Structures are given as C-alpha cells and as structure tokens.
C-alpha cells in the first residue's frame, strides 16, 4: 500500500473541494442577482431557481469523479 | 508504511475546507443581498433564507466525502 | 506500480477541480447578467440560457482528461 | 508516528479553510447588517441571524477536525 | 522509480486545469458584456458569440500540451 | 523527532494563520462599515463595536485547536 | 533522460502553460468586455476591439514555447 | 538533527506571515475609511485610531504562537 | 544527474508563468482603458498601443532568465 | 548540517515575505485614500503620514521572528 | 549530480516571477490612470511615464538577486 | 546531501519576491491616485512621489533578509 491508497485520498479530496469552490463562486453572483430580482417581483422565482441550481452540476461532476476514485480505494 | 493513514486525513481536510470556502464565498454575496432586501421589506425573509441555505449543500457534499474517506481509516 | 496510481489520481482530480473552478468563475457573472436581463425582459431567456450553459466546455474537457487519466489507473 | 504529522496538517487545513470561508462570508454579511443597523435599529435580529448563520461552516470544520483528533 | 506516469499526470492535470481557469476568467467578463449587448439589441449576437469563442484557444492550447505529455504516457 | 513534531508545528501554524486571515477578511469590511456608521452618527459605537469584535471567534476557534494540537508535542 | 526528470519537466511545462493561459485570460477578460462595450453602439470599432483582444495571446505563445522546448530538452 | 527544527521554523514563519496578511487585509479598508472620516471631520481621530488598532490582535496571536513554537527548539 | 535537470524545468515554468501572469494582470487594465480612450477619440491609438505593449518587458525578462538558466543546464 | 538549516531559511523567507504582502495590501488602500485627502487639503498630511506609516509595524513583527530564526540558524 | 542546483533554479524562477507579478499589478492601476489622464490632456505624458516606469525597480531587484544566485551555480 | 543551499535559495527567492508583490499591490493604488491628483493639479507632485516611493521599504527589508541569507551561505 503506502502512497498507493493514500494519494488517491487527497486527489478525490481536492477534486470535490475546489469543484465546490468553483460552484460556490458561480452561486454567489447568481444568488445575489436572483434574490434582487425576487425582491423586485415575485414572478421571477422559477427563473432565479433554475439559474441558481444550474451551476450545481459542478459538484455532481466532482462527486462522480470522487466516486470513481473511491472505487479504486 | 505508517504514512498511509496520515494522507487520508489531509485529503479529507482539504475536502471539507475548500467546500466550506466555496460555501462561504456564496454566502457572502447571497446573504448581503438578502439582508438588503429584508431591511426594506420584511416579507422577503423566507425567500432570503432559502436562497442563503441553498448553497450549504456544498459543505454537505464535502462532509459526505470526508466521512467516506474516514470510513477507510 | 507504487505511488504512480495515487499521483495519477491527484492529477485527474486537480484537472477536474480547476476546470470546475474556471467554468464556475465564468458562470458566476454570466448567470448574473443573464438573470438581470431576464428579470427585465422574459423574451431573452433562451440567449441567456445558452450563454450560461456554453462555458461548460471547460468542465467537459476536464472530465475528458480525467477519464483519460482514469483509463490508465 | 509519521502519520501523526500529516493528521495534524489535515486538521489545520480543515479548521483554517473553513475559518477563511466563514470570514469571507461574514465580511459582506456583517457590513450590510451594520449598514442596515445604522439607518434602522428595528432589524437587529435579522442581521444577527444572517451573520451567525455562516458559522455552521466553522462548526462543520471543527467537528471534522475533532474527529481527526480522535483518530490521532 | 515508477513516478514518471504519476508526475506527468499531475503535469497534464494542472496544465489543462489552469488553462480552463484562464479561459473561464476571460469568458466571464466577455460574455457578461455580450449578454448586456444582446439585451440592448439582438444584432450584436454574432459579435458577442465570436468575442467569447475567441478565448477558447487558451484551453485548446492547454489540452494540446496535455496531449503532448500524454504521448509520452 | 521522527518528522512528527515539525509537521505538527506546521499544522498549528497553518491553522492559526488561516483563521487569522479569515477573520481579517471579515473585519476588513465590517470595521470599515462600522467606522462609516460612526462618522454618520456617534450613537452606533455599541453595535459597530460588537459587530467588529464578533468575528474574532474565528481566531478563538483556531488557536484553541492549535493549543490542543500543541498538547501532543 | 532520468525517469524523475521526465515527470518533473512535465510539471514545469504544465505550470508554464497554465499560468501563461491564466495571465492571457485575465487580460482578455477586461479587454474583451470593453471591446463588446465599444461595439455595443459604435460598431465601426470592430477592428480596433479585435486587434486589442488578439494582442495579449503572446503570453500563452511564450508559455507553450517554453513548454515544447522543455519537451525537446527531455 | 532532522527536519523537525526546520519544519517548526517554517510553521512559525507561515503562522506569522498569514496572521500579518489577515491584519493587513483588515487594516486596508479600515484605515482607508478612517482617514476618510478624519478628513471629513477631525473629531473622530481617536475612534478611527482604535478601530484600526483593534485588528492588530491577529499579529499578536500569530507571534505568540510563533514564540510557543520557538520554545520547542 | 539527479533531480536538478527536472527541477530546473519547474524553475523555468514558474518564472515564465508568473511573469506572464504579471504581464496579463497589467495588460487587462491598460488595454481596457486604452480601448476606451480609442473609442472616445481615434487620435489616442498611438499612445494606447504603446501603453498596452509597454508591460511586455516583464515577460521578456522572465523569458530571458528562463533561457539563461536553461543554458546553465 | 542537514535539512534543518535550509528549512529555517525557508521559514525566514516566507515569514518576511507574507508579512510584507499584508503590509502592502494595507498600504494600498491607506495611501490611496491619504493622497486623495492631501490632493484637496494639505493640512491632513500629519494624519495621513502616521496612518500610512503606523501599519508598517507588522513588517517589523515578521522580521523580528525572522531575525531570531537567523540567530538560531 | 546533486539536488541543490534544481532548488536554486526554482528559487530564482519564483523570485523573478513574483517580482514580475508585483510590477504588473502596480503597472495595471498606474498605467490605467496615466492613459486616462492622457485621454483628456496630452501634456501629462512625461509624468505618466515617470510614474508608471518606476515600479520596474521591483523587476530590477528580482533580476539582480536572480543573477547573484545564478552566480552560485 | 547539500540540499540546504537550494532551500536557502528558495527561501531568499520567496523573501525578495512576495515582498516585491506586496509593494506592487501597494504602489498600484498609491500611484493610480497620485496620477489622478496630478492630472488635476501639478503642485502635488512631491507629495505623490513621496507617497508612491514610501512602500519601497518592504523591498529593502526583503533584500536585507535575502542578503543575510546569502551571507549565511
């Protein structure tokens, strides 16, 4: 074993981690502008929600990569 | 091969840490705009709260990855 | 083998993570501008949607190279 | 032995990056909250709730760090 | 040794990841301005599209050098 | 010796430094807005002070775990 | 051509191309944003905006220059 | 005698470095707004001075951590 | 031989990459303001172009030091 | 000798460098606002100069740690 | 054959690169202000040049330390 | 053996480089505001210059530390 099953741990760790960082960076501006749109008018809720949850594909991609890496653990 | 057990700790460490960092960079702008909207109209509290708690799934995915990694210890 | 598999895991995780970070830092203000346009005119939903979904080419390139690296695992 | 130092490094990373994330959240959140307080004092509770909510990141980071310390 | 494949893997991963990060950084502002211009007038659609498809050469070069190293893999 | 002590020390240093960086990022905006409020009106010296001093819990939670991990030296 | 060197040259050339691409991206972001702002209602500025956008590609150009001279220096 | 002393040194070094980085990040905005308030009116000089000297405790905490680390070598 | 022939490559990569990063982070603002001035008046082309192309000396010095330390192989 | 001397040197280097970085990010905003105040009123020089020079004490805080590390060296 | 030469090279590379990054981040703001001044008055050319060219002393110092450290090779 | 000298080199490289980065981020805002002040009033040239070249003390401190490291070995 040694590094063989140890470095995969840090690999999947950063793979989920900075993917979550990137999607949070995406979520910040979108959420601010979306809640501003909701405060302006309540009819924009569906548009704001589907624009907010669209950058959530980044964590699911990172989780897919992490699951593939964990399959080798 | 004692270094095997130490690196999984580092991996789960940045797995939770970078996810928390992305959650925080989302929470910054989203909470700022939410409290700006609440400070003018008090009926926006529920929308602001759900828009603020929606990016907390990133730290949840980070916790899931950290727990999966800890299961191999 | 040895630590080659672990370092390949680190490399593929780094690739997918930074690709996710790049497409997130794009999609942040892309979706901000898109939802700002939609909140004032509903007719331009499709153009904003395709402009938001277009920067996912970076994350699919990252996924492609991650799968290529995983093929050698 | 050698794993103890790496466990320490992971614990430090887990607590510190979580602290950085909640700090970068509380920056804008507290700035907007005290800006609202300076013009109307009636919304102190909402601003306090919105400022104290991102500390769940600290709670998660410290619980992961304490799990790692127990593993140590 | 045996570290050759792993080290070239991390080289490819960080190369393609940072190329994607740069492409996303460019596309962020360029496509935000493009969304604004398109909302102003529909005739700017092709100009905005080519203006944001131009920085794709950065990630193209990144995957190019990644495949160069993959040739050694 | 045995490489554990030095990495323990670098872990403590990383924890303290990143906690201090996070609370500095918080206090940067919080104290600036608080002193703007104190320039507008002197009566805000309680709320501004407690809002600025509140994110010092980050340093508290950083150096407490730093001391706990120092206990292993 | 040692094995460890064969991977360390990969790390170095990857750092070169990645950071050069990051620099070109951070330049082209503002340059292209201002270019779209200048062609929003002053459409005759297309050539100036295009050459200003295409000017900072020399950074990636030097980066992958270094990369594939390191590839030959393996 | 091993890497322990040098790694303790680098631990205290980045501890004080990141503590000073956080203090500077805070002091930037706090001092800018304080000198703006002082230019607007000279009465708030002491308030601005104490408001910008308050985040100096981060450097104090970092250097006490560094001194504790130095005591182990 | 050793790892010197490999770590010199890391040195060249860091040198040219960070020099290009500095040149790009300058050229962003310089080119944006220059093209704004050109759009305001076409007689500023000669000043704007030389202002934008002046910071290339940074990446040129980075290229020079990389070339001399490549010759120092 | 050993690895301890060089790692102590690394500790000194980043201890002074990161402290100088934090000082610089403070001096940016502080000096900008100070010279903006001076451009409209010369009598504010006494306040601006001390508000610019006083946040240089964390350079001294970092370099005293570096000096005691050099004494240990 | 050894290991110090490569680390000397990477030290020179990062020194040059970080000096170039500092010069670039200075020149961005300074040259942008200079060309903004030129766009309204051509008489500020010499002042703009002598203000934006003195940050090149950072690259000069980085190049000289890189040269004197290459002298060790 | 002898890897200490390369680590002294990377330490002094960091010490000069990111101190230069800090003074660059300071000189950015200071020089931009100084050029803005000069563009409306030339009589502030001395104040703008002595505010712009004041944060060079960061570079001279980093260079003093690097000179100490060079004289060490």
């Amino acid at each position: 074993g040694g590094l063989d099953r140890g470095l995969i741990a840090v690999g999947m760790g950063l793979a989920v981690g900075l993917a979550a960082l990137g999607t949070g960076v995406a979520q910040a501006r979108i959420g601010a502008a979306g809640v501003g749109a909701i405060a302006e008018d309540r009819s924009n809720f569906g548009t704001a929600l589907i624009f907010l949850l669209l950058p959530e594909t980044l964590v699911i991609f990172g989780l897919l990569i992490a699951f593939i890496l964990n399959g080798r653990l | 091969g004692g270094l095997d057990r130490g690196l999984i700790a580092v991996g789960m460490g940045l797995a939770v840490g970078l996810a928390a960092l992305g959650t925080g960079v989302a929470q910054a702008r989203i909470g700022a705009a939410g409290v700006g909207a609440i400070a003018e109209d008090r009926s926006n509290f529920g929308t602001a709260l759900i828009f603020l708690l929606l990016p907390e799934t990133l730290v949840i995915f980070g916790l899931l990855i950290a727990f999966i990694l800890n299961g191999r210890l | 083998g040895g630590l080659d598999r672990g370092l390949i895991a680190v490399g593929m995780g780094l690739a997918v993570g930074l690709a996710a970070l790049g497409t997130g830092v794009a999609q942040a203000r892309i979706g901000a501008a898109g939802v700002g346009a939609i909140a004032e005119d509903r007719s331009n939903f499709g153009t904003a949607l395709i402009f938001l979904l277009l920067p996912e080419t970076l994350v699919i390139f990252g996924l492609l190279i991650a799968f290529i690296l995983n093929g050698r695992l | 032995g050698l794993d103890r130092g790496l466990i320490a490094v992971g614990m430090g990373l887990a607590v510190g990056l979580a602290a950085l994330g909640t700090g970068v959240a509380q920056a804008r959140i507290g700035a907007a909250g005290v800006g609202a307080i300076a013009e109307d004092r009636s919304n102190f509770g909402t601003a306090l709730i919105f400022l104290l909510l991102p500390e769940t990141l600290v709670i998660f980071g410290l619980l992961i760090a304490f799990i790692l310390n127990g593993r140590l | 040794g045996g570290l050759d494949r792993g080290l070239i893997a991390v080289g490819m991963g960080l190369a393609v990841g940072l190329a994607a990060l740069g492409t996303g950084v460019a596309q962020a502002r360029i496509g935000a301005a493009g969304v604004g211009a398109i909302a102003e007038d529909r005739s700017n659609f092709g100009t905005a599209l080519i203006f944001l498809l131009l920085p794709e050469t950065l990630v193209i070069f990144g995957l190019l050098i990644a495949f160069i190293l993959n040739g050694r893999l | 010796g045995g490489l554990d002590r030095g990495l323990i020390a670098v872990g403590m240093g990383l924890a303290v430094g990143l906690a201090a960086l996070g609370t500095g990022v918080a206090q940067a905006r919080i104290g600036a807005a608080g002193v703007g409020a104190i320039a507008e009106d002197r009566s805000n010296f309680g709320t501004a002070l407690i809002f600025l001093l509140l994110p010092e819990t980050l340093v508290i939670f950083g150096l407490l775990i730093a001391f706990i991990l120092n206990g292993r030296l | 051509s040692g094995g460890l060197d064969r991977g360390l040259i990969a790390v170095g050339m990857g750092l070169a191309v990645g950071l050069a691409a990051l620099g070109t991206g951070v330049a082209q972001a503002r340059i292209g944003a201002a270019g779209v702002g200048a062609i929003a209602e002053d459409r005759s500025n297309f050539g100036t905006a295009l050459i200003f956008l295409l000017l900072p590609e020399t950074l990636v150009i030097f980066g992958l220059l270094i990369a594939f001279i390191l590839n030959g220096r393996l | 005698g091993g890497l322990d002393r040098g790694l303790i040194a680098v631990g205290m070094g980045l501890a004080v470095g990141l503590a000073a980085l956080g203090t500077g990040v805070a002091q930037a905005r706090i001092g800018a707004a304080g000198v703006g308030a002082i230019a607007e009116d000279r009465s708030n000089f002491g308030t601005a001075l104490i408001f910008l000297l308050l985040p100096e405790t981060l450097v104090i905490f970092g250097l006490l951590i560094a001194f504790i680390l130095n005591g182990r070598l | 031989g050793g790892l010197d022939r490999g770590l010199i490559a890391v040195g060249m990569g860091l040198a040219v990459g960070l020099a290009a990063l500095g040149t790009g982070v300058a050229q962003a603002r310089i080119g944006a303001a220059g093209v704004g001035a050109i759009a305001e008046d076409r007689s500023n082309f000669g000043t704007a172009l030389i202002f934008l192309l002046l910071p290339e000396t940074l990446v040129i010095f980075g290229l020079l030091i990389a070339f001399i330390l490549n010759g120092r192989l | 000798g050993g690895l301890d001397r060089g790692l102590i040197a690394v500790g000194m280097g980043l201890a002074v460098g990161l402290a100088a970085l934090g000082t610089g990010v403070a001096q940016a905003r502080i000096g900008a606002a100070g010279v903006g105040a001076i451009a409209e009123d010369r009598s504010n020089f006494g306040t601006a100069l001390i508000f610019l020079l006083l946040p240089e004490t964390l350079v001294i805080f970092g370099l005293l740690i570096a000096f005691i590390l050099n004494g240990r060296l | 054959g050894g290991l110090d030469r490569g680390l000397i090279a990477v030290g020179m590379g990062l020194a040059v690169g970080l000096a170039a990054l500092g010069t670039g981040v200075a020149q961005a703001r300074i040259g942008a202000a200079g060309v903004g001044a030129i766009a309204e008055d051509r008489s500020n050319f010499g002042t703009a040049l002598i203000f934006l060219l003195l940050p090149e002393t950072l690259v000069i110092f980085g190049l000289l330390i890189a040269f004197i450290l290459n002298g060790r090779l | 053996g002898g890897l200490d000298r390369g680590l002294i080199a990377v330490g002094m490289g960091l010490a000069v480089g990111l101190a230069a980065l800090g003074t660059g981020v300071a000189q950015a805002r200071i020089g931009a505001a100084g050029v803005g002040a000069i563009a409306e009033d030339r009589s502030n040239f001395g104040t703008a210059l002595i505010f712009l070249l004041l944060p060079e003390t960061l570079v001279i401190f980093g260079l003093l530390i690097a000179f100490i490291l060079n004289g060490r070995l």
Binding site: - | - | - | - | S43, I68 | - | - | - | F61 | - | - | -
Partner: protein, 313 residues
Amino acid sequence: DNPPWAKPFELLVSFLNTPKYGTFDPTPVVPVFFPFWFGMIVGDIGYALLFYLVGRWLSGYVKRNEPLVIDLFALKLKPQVIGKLVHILNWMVFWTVVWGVIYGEFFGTFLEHLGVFGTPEHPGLIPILIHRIDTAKTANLLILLSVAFGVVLVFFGLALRAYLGLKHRHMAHFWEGVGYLGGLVGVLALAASYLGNLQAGWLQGLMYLGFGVFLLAVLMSRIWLMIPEIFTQAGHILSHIRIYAVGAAGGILAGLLTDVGFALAERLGLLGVLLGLLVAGVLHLLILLLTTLGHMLQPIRLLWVEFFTKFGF
C-alpha cells in the same frame, strides 16, 4: 508614390499615421518582411491551398466589380481595396508555400502516410534542413535566426533614425540613435558571452566601446530617455522569438489533429478513414477560424511596434 509591387501594402502603414515631409516612409520594407515572416510563422502549404481558395473566392468580387458587405463584420470593401488585399494575400501565399515545403507540412503531414521528403528518421533523399516538430536541435537555430531578424530590423530602424537626424541637423536624433546602437551591440556582446564563448578577446572590447558610446548620450539624455528605455529596446530585440513560438505551436497542433485522424483510420479502416477525414476537416476548420487572426496579427504587430517606433512614426 511607390513602385507597383510595394503599392498594395500602403494600407498596412497609412492606417496608423502619416509621415512628416522629408522623413522616411516605412512602407517599402513591409512587402519584403511581413509576407516572409507570416509565411514562416504559418509554415504550411495545406492551409496555403485554403488561403489560395479564399483568395480566388475574393477575386470574383474584383472581377465582377461589386462591393463586399458583411453585416456581422460591418465592412464595405470596394473592388479597388479587395484587389490590393488579394495581391497581398497571394504574395503571402508564395512565402508560406516556400516555407511549408521546407517544414514538411501537408495540412499536417503526408510523411506519416508516404515518405515524400527525406529525413534521418525515415531514410531517403537529401533530408530536411530544418524540421518543424523536432524541438531538440532545430529550436536553437530557429531562435537564433529570430534574434538575428530582430537585431537587423532594429538596426535598420534606428539607422534610419540616425539618417533623419543627420538630415534635420538637430543632432539629438542622431546621437541618441548612435548611443542606442552602442547599447544594442553591448547587450548583444554580453548575450553572446553568456551561454557561449566566455570572455572572448574581441567581444569585451566591442562591448566596452558600445557601452561608452551609449553613455556618451548623457549630455542630452541626462534624465528622461537614457536609463529606462534601454530595457524597452532590449525587450523589442527579444520579442522576435514569437515567430518560432507561434510556428511551432501551430505545427504541433496541426500534427496532433492529423494524428488523431490517422489513428482513427488505423482504428477501423473500412469506414473509419472517411469519418476520420471528416473529423479532421471540421477540427482543422475550427482551429483555423480560431487562429488565423493571431497568425496574421503577430508579424505585422512586430513591424508596427518594434520597427515603426524607432524613428518616431
């Protein structure tokens, strides 16, 4: 006025600024430098066929005498301008084919298919003098020739500055030019001493005389333009490696693009050959649409900044 061969290139120089009377017009060197270095930057004959095809497509406009208007580009080119740029294009075609034949390129290469030209790797007739994708040994030659191009271009550029200073009898434009020439030869001597013949007998004296005649210009440039601008001159000298860099980047990208299709044809053969050809065609078209702008822009950018700015154009 100008000779008819250099006449079509007047729009590449008159766009920026117009020269003062009695000075030197920089236009005669554009048709002898820009197509040559653009062609060796591209270094292709397969893409040169596409350039000739688009030139033939553009020449129909000047044949039938109609304006060319594109709405997405917002340009209206008269036939009297289309003819000039078509003349420029098929002038560039000659240089790019004459350098593609010595780079061994066929929209990629046919050498992976058939050994049409000799090489040490695949033995045959007289081999390629300068290979494209082999960066082990051709890189030094290409970098040295690019540096030689930079130094001769700069040398001619401020030799013209010295000539115009001699004509104007201001003597400032002459002495500054001679001093910068001395600085140039001094830094070239230093660069030759570095990573080469260390401490040559005739190099040291040449460097010393160049530095002395560079310092001689202090009596008129004591403050403004003596110390800091030599760094810009050295950067203008060293910025000519982009020719080799862009050439190798395009060559390697095209080689990998055709290698993908070649492996795909190897993968199946019965039907994979046509699919690989189609994929290679669309990918090459996309990359061409991406990079033709930069490939055209870089060598004319060199003549715009590193050569025109010498004599204050």
